Design a protein around this ligand. Structure first.
Ligand SMILES: Cc1ncc(COP(=O)(O)O)c(CN)c1O
Ligand SMILES: Cc1ncc(COP(=O)(O)O)c(CN)c1O
Lengths: 411, 411
């Protein structure tokens, strides 16, 4: 894995902001895209754009082959058994919402439990809150340990014979914890529940094998893994998707349409109303080819290196608190003691450094950590040790700068 | 309006298919895109891609300004009063579904009527069928005249004091009729109903002024008007959108999130769950700038010219039936007597000519016309009279070719 060679593939990194080299450490909000992806989109709009699934004219055929080819790339990428299990959506949020609407809201009665965890992104909270409100079921939260991980015992405790759904993140965007999805699936299934995995933060960073994880549903977002904006995937087990009603209706997903009643296509088209996201899906194909050429295990190893290096260098700074465990994905959430995270991020941007400050779409988790906001930095396959050095230096400098102003005003 | 200069802006047109110059007459399925659009997307991914709405770092700010700037371009383009009325979606289908879910399904009781027409695209049929099934309301269809237009008398007849929604297309993708939206809005409002306009086929082709039309909701698709794939808009009157619940839930659309309950953002963000379609929205901005530079009235005039020319030349061919009225948008649906439309389209493709054959996502309308399928050709700002000549010549040749084979087999 050569990082110089990889960085040469990302045009956006070769620029300055505020007079300094850009240092992009915001990949957990959105990743950057290599030439291969961008040029895939260009080629699509310049040469073979058309509507798909009609195949009566040449361009339409090319477009169709690109689009369904991309479906097959997604299938191999997460190791699903069939393309019928791979549905293209607007992104992880929409995917999770489809499950909550079409699965939860048709199969929850009073009595039923939906169990989430406290570390969940909002996409994996609000749909369930709304499903339980609409059906008079009840929502339960699996508690967290002191280091922000989840114990399987707490899981065994929370899920009972009344649990219909367990909804959890593979990887937390805030704590960087990697949840024990495979064991949690076995637990859920023992109690007769399905598991829905939010795989937004795992898919870009590590091999996903839905047959190994044994999850029922699994959601991911293109923009987090070098892909075009605007597109995501829902994987679901063919037997469950066969029994779910579509979330949206219109052309493309129907077979026969009468005045009053209509029948649906086979999977996957049953779940794709309207002209699909053609170019974004083909670009996502391109992103997958790119990551598979580097190797997901290689990417994973790289991320291990950067995260370990960052935890060490953060521990060398006084007055910084890091949240989450030792074993983690490639991100660090943190606060400078006595400086608000928004201020940290703005000062960091004056040095060319892009990080996130705020609630990270995890307000319940913010409350659990006992804070209003945090700062967060995330590494990806284009990041280096040098970049973490610049971050720690700028945090040192920020500490000095705020203290100096405080002391100055004190006199 | 110089057509040579405009065609120089569309790379995709400069190619051959099957040894012949491409002649793209399938814009009603999807339009092609000029350099300005494609280069907008390239610039986005090459220079300023980031997540939006955080504004703590430079790129994030640029991205935000691009995205919200695009919202303002949409607002000026359809003459809405406020950006709060402009919601970005996946496309027209999703837009119509949002209205059917969040408006219809919360405000229909038994007793209530939803009136559609027979000429509707499926996106504007199936959501309503499903809303009425879920709420025990009833669905009514406004009948068509002999030439496939709608009379205001039939409208006055169909809508009654029990009608809650009237759902209709501005322009039909099959008949090319332009419906009298403004008068139909007045009728609907007299009976205390809202009107939902499907503006997928009108928006690319003519000035839209939602204040003049006085519609309540209006839906359109980027890919039909030179824009990126994957993106659309829902316009709705601010007072109606203020009282609608969101269709999907997650990050970005919340204000405070508790364990059990959550509050929503202000419009428009209330209706945009998840990372939005950043690049596609900015590209759609670019498409709007492009069409406004040519002038929508100019585009409209061009389309009038091509459609009149096509109806004349079709009337010069024996054994072709054209459907729809004399006064029409820039498309012709047709059949060769005695040749199946799929065969017509495949033979046309061997000559480099792209047209559509099938049900056109309007099966009820196909039944009304008394046919299984039709062929359809659509003109746009890159099309010329020469292209219609090549189409009519190829249809003549196709007539001769099928007749010859018939006679040959007869001997
Ligand atoms: C862990 C996680 N889950 C879900 C989401 C929601 O993803 P999207 O905005 O692409 O729908 C995000 C967004 N970054 C995330 O990080
Ligand atoms: C008139 C009309 N209405 C609605 C739609 C549905 O649009 P989309 O596939 O972009 O959702 C189309 C698709 N071409 C259409 O032509």
């Amino acid at each position: 894995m050569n990082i110089t060679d990889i960085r040469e593939q990302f045009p956006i990194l070769h620029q300055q902001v505020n007079g300094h080299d850009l240092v992009y450490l915001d990949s957990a909000a959105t990743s950057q895209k290599p030439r291969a992806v961008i040029e895939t989109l260009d080629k699509y709009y310049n040469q073979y754009n058309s509507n798909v699934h009609r195949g009566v004219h040449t361009l339409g055929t090319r477009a169709t082959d690109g689009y369904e080819g991309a479906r097959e790339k997604v299938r191999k990428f997460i190791n699903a058994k069939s393309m019928a299990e791979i549905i293209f959506t607007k992104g992880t949020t929409t995917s999770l919402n489809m499950v909550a609407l079409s699965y939860a809201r048709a199969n929850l009665k009073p009595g039923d439990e939906v169990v989430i965890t406290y570390m969940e992104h909002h996409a994996n909270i609000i749909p369930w809150q709304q499903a339980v409100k609409a059906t008079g079921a009840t929502l339960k939260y699996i508690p967290l340990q002191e280091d922000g991980t989840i114990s399987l015992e707490d899981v065994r405790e929370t899920v009972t014979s009344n649990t219909k759904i367990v909804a959890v993140s593979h990887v937390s965007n805030v704590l960087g914890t990697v949840n024990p999805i495979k064991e949690m699936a076995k637990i859920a299934h023992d109690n007769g529940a399905v598991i829905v995995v939010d795989g937004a933060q795992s898919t870009p960073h590590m091999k996903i094998d839905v047959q190994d994880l044994d999850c029922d549903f699994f959601a991911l977002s293109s923009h987090k893994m070098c892909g075009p904006t605007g597109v995501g995937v829902l994987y679901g087990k063919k037997a469950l998707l066969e029994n779910m009603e579509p979330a949206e209706f219109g052309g493309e997903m129907i077979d026969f349409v009468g005045l009053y009643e209509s029948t649906w296509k086979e999977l996957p088209w049953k779940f794709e109303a309207g002209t699909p996201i053609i170019a974004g899906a083909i670009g996502l194909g391109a992103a997958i080819d790119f990551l598979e050429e580097i190797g997901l295990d290689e990417i994973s190893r790289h991320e291990h290196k950067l995260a370990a290096y960052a935890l060490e260098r953060f521990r060398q700074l006084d007055g910084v608190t890091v949240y989450g465990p030792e074993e983690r994905a490639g991100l660090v959430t943190f606060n400078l003691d006595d400086v608000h995270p928004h201020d940290v991020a703005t000062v960091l941007d004056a040095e060319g450094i892009a990080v996130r400050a705020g609630h990270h779409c995890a307000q319940p988790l913010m409350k659990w950590l006992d804070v209003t906001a945090t700062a967060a930095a995330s590494f990806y396959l284009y990041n280096t040790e040098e970049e973490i050095d610049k971050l720690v230096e700028a945090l040192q400098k920020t500490k000095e700068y705020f203290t100096n102003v405080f002391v100055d005003l004190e006199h």
